[PDB]
Amino acid sequence: LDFTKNLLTRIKNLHPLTNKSTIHSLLSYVFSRQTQNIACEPMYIDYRKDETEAIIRWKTPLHAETCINAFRTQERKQNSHDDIRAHRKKGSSRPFLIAELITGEEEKNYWRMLKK
């Protein structure tokens, strides 16, 4: 069926005990350092407690691209469940936060499942 392409980013290596509020703040903190031209508008955050992944539905494709560029440029690691600035700490076992654009069949299935 029908959807706006290229809105979705998977965020990987979140702290497993975080929440949507913290994810929103972290994305806005990181996005701020990539651009001042447009506001951070993660319209929906799909996140289940005790997972290490979220799916973000951005307002526009340019917001999604901005997020991907931010995490590609910036080394970030979420230290604790409520860490928003996510500075990498020397000797930390935490992995680097990663943002990937969801495409192809994975993208179609997101919109199919949302509409089920």
mmCIF file of N, CA and C in Angstrom:
data_model
loop_
_atom_site.group_PDB
_atom_site.id
_atom_site.type_symbol
_atom_site.label_atom_id
_atom_site.label_comp_id
_atom_site.label_asym_id
_atom_site.label_seq_id
_atom_site.Cartn_x
_atom_site.Cartn_y
_atom_site.Cartn_z
ATOM 1 N N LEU A 1 0.874 -1.214 0.000
ATOM 2 C CA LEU A 1 0.000 0.000 0.000
ATOM 3 C C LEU A 1 0.901 1.252 0.000
ATOM 4 N N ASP A 2 0.478 2.373 0.601
ATOM 5 C CA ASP A 2 1.091 3.710 0.355
ATOM 6 C C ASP A 2 1.714 4.325 1.613
ATOM 7 N N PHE A 3 2.922 4.867 1.477
ATOM 8 C CA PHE A 3 3.629 5.580 2.566
ATOM 9 C C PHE A 3 4.664 6.554 2.001
ATOM 10 N N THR A 4 5.107 7.516 2.813
ATOM 11 C CA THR A 4 6.223 8.423 2.501
ATOM 12 C C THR A 4 7.512 7.625 2.696
ATOM 13 N N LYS A 5 8.324 7.537 1.663
ATOM 14 C CA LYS A 5 9.579 6.769 1.723
ATOM 15 C C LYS A 5 10.607 7.538 2.569
ATOM 16 N N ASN A 6 11.491 6.736 3.162
ATOM 17 C CA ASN A 6 12.765 7.218 3.767
ATOM 18 C C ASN A 6 12.528 8.033 5.042
ATOM 19 N N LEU A 7 11.489 7.716 5.834
ATOM 20 C CA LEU A 7 11.225 8.383 7.133
ATOM 21 C C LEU A 7 11.830 7.641 8.319
ATOM 22 N N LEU A 8 12.213 6.404 8.152
ATOM 23 C CA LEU A 8 12.470 5.485 9.289
ATOM 24 C C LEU A 8 13.933 5.278 9.529
ATOM 25 N N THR A 9 14.352 5.487 10.771
ATOM 26 C CA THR A 9 15.712 5.105 11.203
ATOM 27 C C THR A 9 15.693 4.112 12.332
ATOM 28 N N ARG A 10 16.424 3.020 12.225
ATOM 29 C CA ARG A 10 16.661 2.120 13.335
ATOM 30 C C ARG A 10 17.819 2.671 14.145
ATOM 31 N N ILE A 11 17.655 2.785 15.427
ATOM 32 C CA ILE A 11 18.722 3.165 16.373
ATOM 33 C C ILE A 11 19.122 1.932 17.124
ATOM 34 N N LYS A 12 20.387 1.583 17.100
ATOM 35 C CA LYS A 12 20.915 0.364 17.719
ATOM 36 C C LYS A 12 21.891 0.732 18.826
ATOM 37 N N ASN A 13 21.999 -0.142 19.794
ATOM 38 C CA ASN A 13 22.929 -0.062 20.928
ATOM 39 C C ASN A 13 22.509 0.987 21.958
ATOM 40 N N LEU A 14 21.201 1.202 22.074
ATOM 41 C CA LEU A 14 20.642 1.951 23.210
ATOM 42 C C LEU A 14 20.862 1.184 24.497
ATOM 43 N N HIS A 15 20.949 1.865 25.596
ATOM 44 C CA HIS A 15 21.006 1.210 26.906
ATOM 45 C C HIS A 15 19.701 0.434 27.076
ATOM 46 N N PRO A 16 19.705 -0.860 27.485
ATOM 47 C CA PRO A 16 18.481 -1.659 27.456
ATOM 48 C C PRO A 16 17.427 -1.181 28.440
ATOM 49 N N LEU A 17 17.784 -0.376 29.435
ATOM 50 C CA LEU A 17 16.798 0.054 30.455
ATOM 51 C C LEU A 17 16.381 1.508 30.291
ATOM 52 N N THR A 18 16.620 2.050 29.087
ATOM 53 C CA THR A 18 16.187 3.434 28.753
ATOM 54 C C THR A 18 14.664 3.527 28.501
ATOM 55 N N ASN A 19 14.237 4.703 28.087
ATOM 56 C CA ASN A 19 12.802 4.946 27.823
ATOM 57 C C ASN A 19 12.671 5.902 26.680
ATOM 58 N N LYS A 20 11.443 6.092 26.225
ATOM 59 C CA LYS A 20 11.181 6.930 25.059
ATOM 60 C C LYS A 20 11.554 8.380 25.323
ATOM 61 N N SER A 21 11.333 8.864 26.537
ATOM 62 C CA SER A 21 11.664 10.246 26.912
ATOM 63 C C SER A 21 13.175 10.500 26.727
ATOM 64 N N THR A 22 13.976 9.566 27.229
ATOM 65 C CA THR A 22 15.440 9.670 27.154
ATOM 66 C C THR A 22 15.875 9.568 25.684
ATOM 67 N N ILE A 23 15.303 8.646 24.929
ATOM 68 C CA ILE A 23 15.637 8.504 23.500
ATOM 69 C C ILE A 23 15.343 9.804 22.775
ATOM 70 N N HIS A 24 14.183 10.401 23.029
ATOM 71 C CA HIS A 24 13.821 11.689 22.396
ATOM 72 C C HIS A 24 14.905 12.732 22.728
ATOM 73 N N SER A 25 15.267 12.866 23.977
ATOM 74 C CA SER A 25 16.245 13.878 24.416
ATOM 75 C C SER A 25 17.613 13.606 23.796
ATOM 76 N N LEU A 26 18.004 12.356 23.729
ATOM 77 C CA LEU A 26 19.316 12.007 23.166
ATOM 78 C C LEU A 26 19.303 12.355 21.679
ATOM 79 N N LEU A 27 18.252 11.947 20.953
ATOM 80 C CA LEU A 27 18.200 12.247 19.505
ATOM 81 C C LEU A 27 18.263 13.747 19.318
ATOM 82 N N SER A 28 17.545 14.560 20.094
ATOM 83 C CA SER A 28 17.500 16.039 19.969
ATOM 84 C C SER A 28 18.878 16.640 20.298
ATOM 85 N N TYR A 29 19.565 16.069 21.280
ATOM 86 C CA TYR A 29 20.900 16.555 21.707
ATOM 87 C C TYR A 29 21.891 16.302 20.572
ATOM 88 N N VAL A 30 21.908 15.127 19.989
ATOM 89 C CA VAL A 30 22.782 14.718 18.883
ATOM 90 C C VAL A 30 22.449 15.480 17.607
ATOM 91 N N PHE A 31 21.178 15.604 17.295
ATOM 92 C CA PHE A 31 20.689 16.282 16.069
ATOM 93 C C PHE A 31 21.112 17.723 16.140
ATOM 94 N N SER A 32 21.073 18.401 17.285
ATOM 95 C CA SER A 32 21.443 19.818 17.511
ATOM 96 C C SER A 32 22.876 20.034 17.038
ATOM 97 N N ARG A 33 23.746 19.042 17.216
ATOM 98 C CA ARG A 33 25.206 19.186 16.930
ATOM 99 C C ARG A 33 25.473 18.889 15.467
ATOM 100 N N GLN A 34 24.535 18.348 14.720
ATOM 101 C CA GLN A 34 24.643 18.110 13.269
ATOM 102 C C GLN A 34 24.074 19.304 12.509
ATOM 103 N N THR A 35 23.026 19.948 12.994
ATOM 104 C CA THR A 35 22.452 21.124 12.275
ATOM 105 C C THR A 35 21.665 22.021 13.217
ATOM 106 N N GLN A 36 21.629 23.309 12.873
ATOM 107 C CA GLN A 36 20.740 24.303 13.511
ATOM 108 C C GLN A 36 19.689 24.748 12.493
ATOM 109 N N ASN A 37 19.734 24.217 11.276
ATOM 110 C CA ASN A 37 18.884 24.699 10.153
ATOM 111 C C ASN A 37 17.448 24.211 10.345
ATOM 112 N N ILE A 38 17.285 23.002 10.880
ATOM 113 C CA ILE A 38 15.935 22.396 11.103
ATOM 114 C C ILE A 38 15.896 21.790 12.503
ATOM 115 N N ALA A 39 14.716 21.772 13.059
ATOM 116 C CA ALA A 39 14.457 21.270 14.417
ATOM 117 C C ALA A 39 14.488 19.740 14.371
ATOM 118 N N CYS A 40 14.797 19.129 15.483
ATOM 119 C CA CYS A 40 14.713 17.665 15.622
ATOM 120 C C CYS A 40 13.251 17.289 15.777
ATOM 121 N N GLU A 41 12.701 16.545 14.825
ATOM 122 C CA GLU A 41 11.245 16.204 14.855
ATOM 123 C C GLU A 41 11.079 14.710 14.656
ATOM 124 N N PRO A 42 11.356 13.904 15.715
ATOM 125 C CA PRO A 42 11.151 12.476 15.703
ATOM 126 C C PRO A 42 9.699 12.232 16.083
ATOM 127 N N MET A 43 8.814 12.202 15.113
ATOM 128 C CA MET A 43 7.403 12.283 15.393
ATOM 129 C C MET A 43 6.958 11.075 16.213
ATOM 130 N N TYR A 44 7.425 9.873 15.859
ATOM 131 C CA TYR A 44 7.103 8.713 16.645
ATOM 132 C C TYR A 44 8.371 7.960 17.005
ATOM 133 N N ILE A 45 8.445 7.474 18.221
ATOM 134 C CA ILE A 45 9.546 6.615 18.698
ATOM 135 C C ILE A 45 8.945 5.286 19.064
ATOM 136 N N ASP A 46 9.244 4.260 18.353
ATOM 137 C CA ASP A 46 8.805 2.887 18.623
ATOM 138 C C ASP A 46 9.882 2.212 19.468
ATOM 139 N N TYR A 47 9.586 1.922 20.703
ATOM 140 C CA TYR A 47 10.598 1.371 21.643
ATOM 141 C C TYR A 47 9.887 0.528 22.707
ATOM 142 N N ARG A 48 10.413 -0.658 22.924
ATOM 143 C CA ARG A 48 9.908 -1.610 23.937
ATOM 144 C C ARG A 48 10.973 -1.654 25.031
ATOM 145 N N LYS A 49 10.524 -1.481 26.262
ATOM 146 C CA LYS A 49 11.409 -1.624 27.420
ATOM 147 C C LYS A 49 12.213 -2.937 27.346
ATOM 148 N N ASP A 50 13.496 -2.770 27.656
ATOM 149 C CA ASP A 50 14.479 -3.851 27.785
ATOM 150 C C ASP A 50 14.916 -4.372 26.428
ATOM 151 N N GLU A 51 14.688 -3.587 25.349
ATOM 152 C CA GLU A 51 15.337 -3.738 24.057
ATOM 153 C C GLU A 51 16.470 -2.717 23.922
ATOM 154 N N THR A 52 17.358 -3.005 22.988
ATOM 155 C CA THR A 52 18.511 -2.148 22.683
ATOM 156 C C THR A 52 18.374 -1.425 21.364
ATOM 157 N N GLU A 53 17.206 -1.518 20.723
ATOM 158 C CA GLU A 53 16.886 -0.931 19.414
ATOM 159 C C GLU A 53 15.599 -0.116 19.531
ATOM 160 N N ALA A 54 15.490 0.924 18.725
ATOM 161 C CA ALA A 54 14.246 1.696 18.565
ATOM 162 C C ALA A 54 14.109 1.937 17.086
ATOM 163 N N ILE A 55 12.873 2.179 16.660
ATOM 164 C CA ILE A 55 12.587 2.684 15.289
ATOM 165 C C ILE A 55 11.973 4.041 15.395
ATOM 166 N N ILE A 56 12.579 5.001 14.724
ATOM 167 C CA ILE A 56 12.117 6.379 14.718
ATOM 168 C C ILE A 56 11.410 6.704 13.404
ATOM 169 N N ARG A 57 10.208 7.238 13.520
ATOM 170 C CA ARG A 57 9.484 7.741 12.337
ATOM 171 C C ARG A 57 9.659 9.231 12.371
ATOM 172 N N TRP A 58 10.484 9.766 11.483
ATOM 173 C CA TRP A 58 10.817 11.195 11.454
ATOM 174 C C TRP A 58 9.705 11.969 10.740
ATOM 175 N N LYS A 59 9.622 13.261 10.949
ATOM 176 C CA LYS A 59 8.566 14.069 10.297
ATOM 177 C C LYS A 59 8.794 14.033 8.801
ATOM 178 N N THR A 60 10.039 14.141 8.341
ATOM 179 C CA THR A 60 10.395 14.275 6.920
ATOM 180 C C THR A 60 11.606 13.425 6.626
ATOM 181 N N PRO A 61 11.853 13.088 5.359
ATOM 182 C CA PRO A 61 13.068 12.383 4.971
ATOM 183 C C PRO A 61 14.335 13.178 5.324
ATOM 184 N N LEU A 62 14.324 14.491 5.241
ATOM 185 C CA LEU A 62 15.549 15.275 5.527
ATOM 186 C C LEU A 62 15.867 15.108 7.025
ATOM 187 N N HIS A 63 14.862 14.984 7.876
ATOM 188 C CA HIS A 63 15.154 14.753 9.310
ATOM 189 C C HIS A 63 15.831 13.389 9.477
ATOM 190 N N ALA A 64 15.351 12.343 8.844
ATOM 191 C CA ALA A 64 15.927 11.003 8.898
ATOM 192 C C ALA A 64 17.383 11.032 8.426
ATOM 193 N N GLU A 65 17.615 11.696 7.292
ATOM 194 C CA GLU A 65 18.994 11.773 6.739
ATOM 195 C C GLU A 65 19.888 12.491 7.759
ATOM 196 N N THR A 66 19.398 13.540 8.363
ATOM 197 C CA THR A 66 20.161 14.331 9.342
ATOM 198 C C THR A 66 20.555 13.418 10.493
ATOM 199 N N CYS A 67 19.628 12.613 10.982
ATOM 200 C CA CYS A 67 19.905 11.667 12.091
ATOM 201 C C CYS A 67 21.023 10.695 11.678
ATOM 202 N N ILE A 68 20.916 10.090 10.491
ATOM 203 C CA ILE A 68 21.926 9.118 9.998
ATOM 204 C C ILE A 68 23.301 9.800 9.943
ATOM 205 N N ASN A 69 23.338 11.024 9.426
ATOM 206 C CA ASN A 69 24.642 11.745 9.305
ATOM 207 C C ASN A 69 25.170 12.042 10.704
ATOM 208 N N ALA A 70 24.323 12.389 11.660
ATOM 209 C CA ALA A 70 24.759 12.758 13.013
ATOM 210 C C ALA A 70 25.448 11.565 13.634
ATOM 211 N N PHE A 71 24.871 10.378 13.652
ATOM 212 C CA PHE A 71 25.464 9.210 14.312
ATOM 213 C C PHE A 71 26.647 8.649 13.546
ATOM 214 N N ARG A 72 26.723 8.922 12.252
ATOM 215 C CA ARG A 72 27.899 8.527 11.442
ATOM 216 C C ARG A 72 29.102 9.408 11.774
ATOM 217 N N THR A 73 28.869 10.703 12.052
ATOM 218 C CA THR A 73 29.908 11.743 12.385
ATOM 219 C C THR A 73 30.347 11.633 13.842
ATOM 220 N N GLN A 74 29.397 11.412 14.711
ATOM 221 C CA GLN A 74 29.587 11.602 16.152
ATOM 222 C C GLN A 74 29.661 10.244 16.833
ATOM 223 N N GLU A 75 30.724 9.958 17.536
ATOM 224 C CA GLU A 75 30.842 8.792 18.431
ATOM 225 C C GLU A 75 30.000 9.031 19.658
ATOM 226 N N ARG A 76 28.966 8.245 19.851
ATOM 227 C CA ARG A 76 28.086 8.402 21.037
ATOM 228 C C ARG A 76 27.898 7.015 21.665
ATOM 229 N N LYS A 77 27.851 6.928 22.990
ATOM 230 C CA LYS A 77 27.534 5.708 23.716
ATOM 231 C C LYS A 77 26.689 6.100 24.881
ATOM 232 N N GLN A 78 25.544 5.455 25.014
ATOM 233 C CA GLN A 78 24.653 5.779 26.096
ATOM 234 C C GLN A 78 25.140 5.025 27.323
ATOM 235 N N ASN A 79 25.614 5.708 28.335
ATOM 236 C CA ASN A 79 26.344 5.223 29.529
ATOM 237 C C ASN A 79 25.368 4.562 30.501
ATOM 238 N N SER A 80 24.148 5.060 30.579
ATOM 239 C CA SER A 80 23.197 4.692 31.649
ATOM 240 C C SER A 80 21.835 4.856 31.034
ATOM 241 N N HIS A 81 20.818 4.393 31.730
ATOM 242 C CA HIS A 81 19.454 4.411 31.196
ATOM 243 C C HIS A 81 18.962 5.818 30.946
ATOM 244 N N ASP A 82 19.427 6.842 31.629
ATOM 245 C CA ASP A 82 18.988 8.231 31.557
ATOM 246 C C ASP A 82 20.057 9.168 30.976
ATOM 247 N N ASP A 83 21.080 8.610 30.345
ATOM 248 C CA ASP A 83 22.152 9.410 29.693
ATOM 249 C C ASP A 83 21.617 10.012 28.385
ATOM 250 N N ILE A 84 21.623 11.327 28.273
ATOM 251 C CA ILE A 84 21.205 12.045 27.047
ATOM 252 C C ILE A 84 22.404 12.455 26.210
ATOM 253 N N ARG A 85 23.522 12.883 26.760
ATOM 254 C CA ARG A 85 24.643 13.420 25.936
ATOM 255 C C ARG A 85 25.497 12.277 25.394
ATOM 256 N N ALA A 86 25.518 11.110 26.058
ATOM 257 C CA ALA A 86 26.074 9.856 25.523
ATOM 258 C C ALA A 86 27.524 10.046 25.069
ATOM 259 N N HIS A 87 28.346 10.640 25.921
ATOM 260 C CA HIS A 87 29.799 10.668 25.629
ATOM 261 C C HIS A 87 30.457 9.290 25.726
ATOM 262 N N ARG A 88 31.275 8.944 24.742
ATOM 263 C CA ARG A 88 32.134 7.740 24.846
ATOM 264 C C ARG A 88 33.102 7.929 26.025
ATOM 265 N N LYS A 89 33.197 6.930 26.890
ATOM 266 C CA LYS A 89 34.143 6.906 28.038
ATOM 267 C C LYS A 89 35.210 5.855 27.712
ATOM 268 N N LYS A 90 36.482 6.230 27.828
ATOM 269 C CA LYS A 90 37.636 5.280 27.749
ATOM 270 C C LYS A 90 37.387 4.049 28.635
ATOM 271 N N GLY A 91 37.576 2.862 28.057
ATOM 272 C CA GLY A 91 37.477 1.564 28.754
ATOM 273 C C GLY A 91 36.041 1.081 28.915
ATOM 274 N N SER A 92 35.061 1.824 28.378
ATOM 275 C CA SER A 92 33.625 1.466 28.471
ATOM 276 C C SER A 92 33.327 0.239 27.613
ATOM 277 N N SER A 93 32.601 -0.734 28.166
ATOM 278 C CA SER A 93 32.131 -1.907 27.388
ATOM 279 C C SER A 93 30.895 -1.585 26.528
ATOM 280 N N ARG A 94 30.309 -0.403 26.678
ATOM 281 C CA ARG A 94 29.115 -0.012 25.888
ATOM 282 C C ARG A 94 29.508 0.038 24.412
ATOM 283 N N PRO A 95 28.692 -0.444 23.442
ATOM 284 C CA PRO A 95 28.950 -0.238 22.011
ATOM 285 C C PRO A 95 28.563 1.173 21.534
ATOM 286 N N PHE A 96 29.002 1.594 20.345
ATOM 287 C CA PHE A 96 28.629 2.922 19.776
ATOM 288 C C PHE A 96 27.200 2.872 19.278
ATOM 289 N N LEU A 97 26.437 3.910 19.582
ATOM 290 C CA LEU A 97 25.107 4.118 18.984
ATOM 291 C C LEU A 97 25.241 4.176 17.469
ATOM 292 N N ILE A 98 24.310 3.531 16.782
ATOM 293 C CA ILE A 98 24.285 3.403 15.310
ATOM 294 C C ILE A 98 22.887 3.807 14.815
ATOM 295 N N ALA A 99 22.749 4.544 13.734
ATOM 296 C CA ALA A 99 21.446 4.884 13.121
ATOM 297 C C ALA A 99 21.493 4.370 11.690
ATOM 298 N N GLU A 100 20.488 3.618 11.273
ATOM 299 C CA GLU A 100 20.433 3.049 9.893
ATOM 300 C C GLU A 100 19.076 3.400 9.295
ATOM 301 N N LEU A 101 19.065 3.807 8.044
ATOM 302 C CA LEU A 101 17.796 4.023 7.325
ATOM 303 C C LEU A 101 17.146 2.690 6.993
ATOM 304 N N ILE A 102 15.875 2.523 7.324
ATOM 305 C CA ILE A 102 15.120 1.291 6.994
ATOM 306 C C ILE A 102 14.503 1.426 5.606
ATOM 307 N N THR A 103 14.810 0.445 4.748
ATOM 308 C CA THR A 103 14.447 0.514 3.306
ATOM 309 C C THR A 103 13.859 -0.835 2.901
ATOM 310 N N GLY A 104 13.487 -0.878 1.620
ATOM 311 C CA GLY A 104 13.085 -2.122 0.955
ATOM 312 C C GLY A 104 11.944 -2.804 1.667
ATOM 313 N N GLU A 105 12.026 -4.109 1.814
ATOM 314 C CA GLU A 105 10.934 -4.920 2.386
ATOM 315 C C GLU A 105 10.706 -4.570 3.869
ATOM 316 N N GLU A 106 11.782 -4.292 4.603
ATOM 317 C CA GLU A 106 11.717 -3.921 6.042
ATOM 318 C C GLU A 106 10.848 -2.679 6.210
ATOM 319 N N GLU A 107 11.053 -1.689 5.345
ATOM 320 C CA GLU A 107 10.252 -0.436 5.325
ATOM 321 C C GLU A 107 8.813 -0.777 4.982
ATOM 322 N N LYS A 108 8.600 -1.575 3.930
ATOM 323 C CA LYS A 108 7.203 -1.879 3.544
ATOM 324 C C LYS A 108 6.519 -2.556 4.710
ATOM 325 N N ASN A 109 7.179 -3.455 5.414
ATOM 326 C CA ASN A 109 6.573 -4.247 6.495
ATOM 327 C C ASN A 109 6.235 -3.330 7.675
ATOM 328 N N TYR A 110 7.070 -2.319 7.958
ATOM 329 C CA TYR A 110 6.750 -1.356 9.034
ATOM 330 C C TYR A 110 5.374 -0.751 8.789
ATOM 331 N N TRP A 111 5.165 -0.222 7.603
ATOM 332 C CA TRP A 111 3.922 0.460 7.239
ATOM 333 C C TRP A 111 2.789 -0.563 7.147
ATOM 334 N N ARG A 112 3.058 -1.779 6.672
ATOM 335 C CA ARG A 112 2.006 -2.841 6.655
ATOM 336 C C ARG A 112 1.568 -3.154 8.080
ATOM 337 N N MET A 113 2.519 -3.362 9.004
ATOM 338 C CA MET A 113 2.234 -3.720 10.391
ATOM 339 C C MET A 113 1.529 -2.581 11.116
ATOM 340 N N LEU A 114 1.938 -1.342 10.822
ATOM 341 C CA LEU A 114 1.271 -0.217 11.458
ATOM 342 C C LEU A 114 -0.194 -0.224 11.042
ATOM 343 N N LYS A 115 -0.481 -0.633 9.818
ATOM 344 C CA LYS A 115 -1.859 -0.560 9.251
ATOM 345 C C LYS A 115 -2.641 -1.857 9.504
ATOM 346 N N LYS A 116 -2.073 -2.870 10.162
ATOM 347 C CA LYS A 116 -2.804 -4.155 10.393
ATOM 348 C C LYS A 116 -3.942 -3.922 11.388
#
